Each structure stands twice: as C-alpha cells, then as structure tokens.
Design a protein around this ligand. Structure first.
Ligand SMILES: O=c1cc(CNc2ccc(Cl)cc2)[nH]c2nc(-c3ccccc3)nn12
Length: 134
C-alpha cells in the first residue's frame, strides 16, 4: 500500500463552482469555456510502481497524464495549452503546478470524506470541483 491509495479509482463530477471564472482567468476562449463547462468528466486515477496515471474522460475531451511525483513533464491541457507540469504530494494533497507563457496555475486534489475535492487556482480565482466514486 502506498502514497496515493485513497485516490485510486474512478470518480465522477458531482458539483462545480466558479469554473467559468477560473477558465477566464486562465485565458480559455468563449466557445471552449461553454463546452468544457458542460462536461461531467469521469476521472480515473491509477498507480503502477512509481508512475501515477490520471485520465479524464468526457464528452468534451479525453486526456491522460502519467507522471512520477516531483518530476516535471510536458502536458497538453484539455483547452490546448502546452504547459510544463510538476505534481507533488504535500501533506496528503496532490499539488499540480502548470507553467506556460510566464503564467502559473495550481490544481490541488484531496480526499475529504467520500469525496475527491479538486481546487483550481489562477491568480485570485479559485474553482472547487467535487467528485464522488463512480
Ligand atoms: O475537474 C477538474 C478540473 C481541473 C483543472 N484542469 C482543467 C483545465 C482546463 C479545462 Cl478545459 C478542464 C480542466 N483538473 C481536474 N482534475 C480532476 C480530477 C478529478 C478526480 C480525479 C482525478 C482528477 N478533475 N478536475
């Protein structure tokens, strides 16, 4: 048993707050915001050795990242940003930092009760997305 055991599984989006405003702050254009905001993604987390895989499957866009904690990787986000990402575990929270064009956003993922809570921060704007087991 290891580092991310309580994250592993298939999760379904059950609530969202402020996501449109977060996407605006990131620089996502109107049409992409509208379609991405409608999505109800399933997020699938798995671990094999030191490699963590996070897949996001939705009607908008299927994405997949695999990574080792602390080790930078290149990521193409669902809104088509080309970013440099680093994911670490900080006090039991997965902290995912994306850097591009001189900008930075942080996505935190944590277990709280039977939920997986995702907090997306770009400058002063936070969006909270709550997932439950599928
Ligand atoms: O709902 C979101 C939103 C973001 C923020 N990235 C993002 C940026 C641009 C767009 Cl257009 C869409 C998404 N990251 C994120 N990770 C997970 C998640 C949930 C459960 C298990 C594993 C991962 N959900 N979630």
């Amino acid at each position: 048993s290891h580092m991310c055991d309580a994250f592993v599984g298939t999760w379904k989006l059950v609530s969202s707050e402020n996501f449109d405003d977060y996407m605006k702050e990131v620089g996502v254009g109107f049409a992409t915001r509208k379609v991405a905001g409608m999505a109800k993604p399933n997020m699938i987390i798995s671990v094999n050795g030191d490699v963590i895989t996070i897949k996001s499957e939705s009607t908008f866009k299927n994405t997949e990242i695999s990574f080792i904690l602390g080790q930078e990787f290149d990521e193409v986000t669902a809104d088509d940003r080309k970013v440099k990402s680093t994911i670490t575990l900080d006090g039991g929270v997965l902290v995912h930092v994306q850097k591009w064009d001189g900008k930075s956003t942080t996505i935190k993922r944590k277990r709280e009760d039977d939920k997986l809570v995702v907090e997306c921060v770009m400058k002063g704007v936070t969006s909270t997305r709550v997932y439950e087991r599928a």
